[PDB]
Amino acid sequence: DELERAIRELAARIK
Amino acid sequence: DELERAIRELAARIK
Amino acid sequence: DELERAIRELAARIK
Amino acid sequence: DELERAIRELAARIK
Amino acid sequence: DELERAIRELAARIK
Amino acid sequence: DELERAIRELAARIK
Amino acid sequence: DELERAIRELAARIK
Amino acid sequence: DELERAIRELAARIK
Ligand SMILES: [Cl-]
Ligand SMILES: [Mg+2]
Fold first, then answer.
1. Helix (H, G, I), strand (E, B) or coil at D14
2. Which residue is closest to D9 within chain H, CA to CA?
3. H4 with A3: Cβ contact below 8 A
């Protein structure tokens, strides 16, 4: 899923 | 993952 | 982890 | 307000 | 208000 | 203003 | 202005 | 589309 991967990227950047 | 889950819940909320 | 906690808390309140 | 805070903590991480 | 100001700050940093 | 407006509209969807 | 446009286009789609 | 993109463009701006 493209939304799930986008969210994974944002969470990685925040952390 | 907990942060990913929270972002997903906020995203679902917006959409 | 300030942003992360802020996001977690907002999601927790929303649901 | 969890919302206002998520918005400020986001603003703080924006380069 | 508090929210309107948080939003003002966020928009400022984005731009 | 338009970015503040959009952010305001999104904040209202989370609320 | 990439984040700014992505946010305004999202708000126009889901206001 | 719009949501996935906003999330990615946000991620790119997170320091
Ligand atoms: Cl990816
Ligand atoms: Mg673009």
1. strand
2. H14
3. yes
Contacts 24+ apart (CB under 8 A), H2-6: H2/G6, H2/G9, H2/G10, H2/G13, H2/G14, H3/A3, H3/B11, H3/B14, H3/B15, H3/G10, H3/G14, H4/A2, H4/A3, H4/A6, H5/A6, H5/G6, H5/G9, H5/G10, H6/G3, H6/G6, H6/G7, H6/G9, H6/G10
Counting one residue from chain C and one from chain D, the pairs whose CB atoms sit within 8 A come to 23
**Does C have 3 or more CB contacts under 8 Å with D?**
yes
Entry resolution (Å): 2.0
